[PDB]
Amino acid sequence: PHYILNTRFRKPYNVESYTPQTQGKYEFILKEYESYSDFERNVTEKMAS
Amino acid sequence: EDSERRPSCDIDKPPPNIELTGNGYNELTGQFRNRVINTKSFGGQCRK
């Protein structure tokens, strides 16, 4: 007899052991990048004679 | 064939994953190993 989650299972002759394991490991990586660049120029010149 | 004396006294479910506890253990790797102690046996003494 072998019960997993209230279900009747039968171990075959080739399998030694089959045990349930939670083993929950999750990863989540988030990266952001922003760059601002501004340039302004206004030159005024006047000459009179 | 003729199994008298009420075999297993209608006891159906064993502990869920006692085989994991009965399984071997390694200390330098932190990972479990194969089963060593056969806890699925009963020896005839049914313990409900």
mmCIF file of N, CA, C and O in Angstrom, chain A residues 1-4 6 11 16-17 19-21, chain B residues 12-14 16-17 19-20 34-35 40 42:
data_model
loop_
_atom_site.group_PDB
_atom_site.id
_atom_site.type_symbol
_atom_site.label_atom_id
_atom_site.label_comp_id
_atom_site.label_asym_id
_atom_site.label_seq_id
_atom_site.Cartn_x
_atom_site.Cartn_y
_atom_site.Cartn_z
ATOM 1 N N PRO A 1 0.830 -1.213 0.000
ATOM 2 C CA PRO A 1 0.000 0.000 0.000
ATOM 3 C C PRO A 1 0.860 1.256 0.000
ATOM 4 O O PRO A 1 1.823 1.370 0.762
ATOM 5 N N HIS A 2 0.500 2.203 -0.866
ATOM 6 C CA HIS A 2 1.184 3.490 -0.941
ATOM 7 C C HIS A 2 0.158 4.553 -1.290
ATOM 8 O O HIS A 2 -0.432 4.508 -2.374
ATOM 9 N N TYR A 3 -0.057 5.501 -0.382
ATOM 10 C CA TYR A 3 -1.059 6.545 -0.552
ATOM 11 C C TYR A 3 -0.378 7.896 -0.705
ATOM 12 O O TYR A 3 0.461 8.272 0.122
ATOM 13 N N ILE A 4 -0.740 8.621 -1.761
ATOM 14 C CA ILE A 4 -0.248 9.970 -2.014
ATOM 15 C C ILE A 4 -1.460 10.848 -2.290
ATOM 16 O O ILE A 4 -2.155 10.655 -3.296
ATOM 17 N N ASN A 6 -4.359 11.032 -0.653
ATOM 18 C CA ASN A 6 -5.581 10.231 -0.543
ATOM 19 C C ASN A 6 -5.879 9.458 -1.826
ATOM 20 O O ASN A 6 -7.043 9.254 -2.184
ATOM 21 N N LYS A 11 3.545 0.760 -5.985
ATOM 22 C CA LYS A 11 4.933 0.913 -6.402
ATOM 23 C C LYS A 11 5.336 -0.249 -7.304
ATOM 24 O O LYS A 11 5.213 -1.410 -6.899
ATOM 25 N N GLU A 16 12.463 2.304 -6.755
ATOM 26 C CA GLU A 16 12.868 2.071 -5.373
ATOM 27 C C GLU A 16 12.045 2.909 -4.401
ATOM 28 O O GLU A 16 11.533 2.391 -3.402
ATOM 29 N N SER A 17 11.903 4.204 -4.678
ATOM 30 C CA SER A 17 11.162 5.093 -3.796
ATOM 31 C C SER A 17 10.694 6.303 -4.590
ATOM 32 O O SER A 17 11.447 6.847 -5.403
ATOM 33 N N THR A 19 8.719 9.633 -3.365
ATOM 34 C CA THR A 19 8.116 10.394 -2.284
ATOM 35 C C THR A 19 7.808 11.821 -2.724
ATOM 36 O O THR A 19 8.630 12.454 -3.399
ATOM 37 N N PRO A 20 6.640 12.349 -2.365
ATOM 38 C CA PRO A 20 6.315 13.734 -2.730
ATOM 39 C C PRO A 20 7.159 14.728 -1.946
ATOM 40 O O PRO A 20 7.485 14.511 -0.777
ATOM 41 N N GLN A 21 7.511 15.828 -2.608
ATOM 42 C CA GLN A 21 8.306 16.885 -1.999
ATOM 43 C C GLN A 21 7.777 18.236 -2.454
ATOM 44 O O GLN A 21 7.472 18.426 -3.635
ATOM 45 N N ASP B 12 -7.063 1.803 6.778
ATOM 46 C CA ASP B 12 -6.819 2.095 5.370
ATOM 47 C C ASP B 12 -5.571 2.944 5.154
ATOM 48 O O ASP B 12 -4.664 2.543 4.420
ATOM 49 N N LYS B 13 -5.498 4.112 5.797
ATOM 50 C CA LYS B 13 -4.467 5.054 5.390
ATOM 51 C C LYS B 13 -3.308 5.086 6.379
ATOM 52 O O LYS B 13 -3.523 5.219 7.589
ATOM 53 N N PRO B 14 -2.078 4.967 5.890
ATOM 54 C CA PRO B 14 -0.906 5.174 6.742
ATOM 55 C C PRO B 14 -0.567 6.652 6.823
ATOM 56 O O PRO B 14 -1.273 7.482 6.231
ATOM 57 N N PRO B 16 1.136 10.107 5.749
ATOM 58 C CA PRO B 16 1.263 10.529 4.345
ATOM 59 C C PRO B 16 2.611 10.220 3.709
ATOM 60 O O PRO B 16 2.673 9.511 2.700
ATOM 61 N N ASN B 17 3.692 10.740 4.283
ATOM 62 C CA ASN B 17 5.029 10.609 3.708
ATOM 63 C C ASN B 17 6.040 10.226 4.780
ATOM 64 O O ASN B 17 7.107 10.832 4.913
ATOM 65 N N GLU B 19 7.805 7.743 4.641
ATOM 66 C CA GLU B 19 8.980 7.242 3.936
ATOM 67 C C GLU B 19 10.061 8.310 3.821
ATOM 68 O O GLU B 19 11.253 7.984 3.776
ATOM 69 N N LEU B 20 9.668 9.584 3.769
ATOM 70 C CA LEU B 20 10.651 10.662 3.734
ATOM 71 C C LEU B 20 11.436 10.730 5.038
ATOM 72 O O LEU B 20 12.653 10.949 5.025
ATOM 73 N N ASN B 34 18.018 7.746 -0.200
ATOM 74 C CA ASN B 34 17.056 6.672 -0.394
ATOM 75 C C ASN B 34 16.527 6.167 0.943
ATOM 76 O O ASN B 34 17.106 6.400 2.009
ATOM 77 N N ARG B 35 15.397 5.470 0.871
ATOM 78 C CA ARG B 35 14.815 4.855 2.054
ATOM 79 C C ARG B 35 15.734 3.768 2.602
ATOM 80 O O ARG B 35 16.358 3.018 1.847
ATOM 81 N N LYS B 40 6.819 0.850 6.013
ATOM 82 C CA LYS B 40 5.567 0.370 5.439
ATOM 83 C C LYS B 40 5.132 -0.962 6.034
ATOM 84 O O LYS B 40 3.952 -1.318 5.927
ATOM 85 N N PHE B 42 4.222 -3.756 9.049
ATOM 86 C CA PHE B 42 3.350 -3.651 10.212
ATOM 87 C C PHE B 42 3.620 -4.685 11.292
ATOM 88 O O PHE B 42 3.258 -4.441 12.449
#
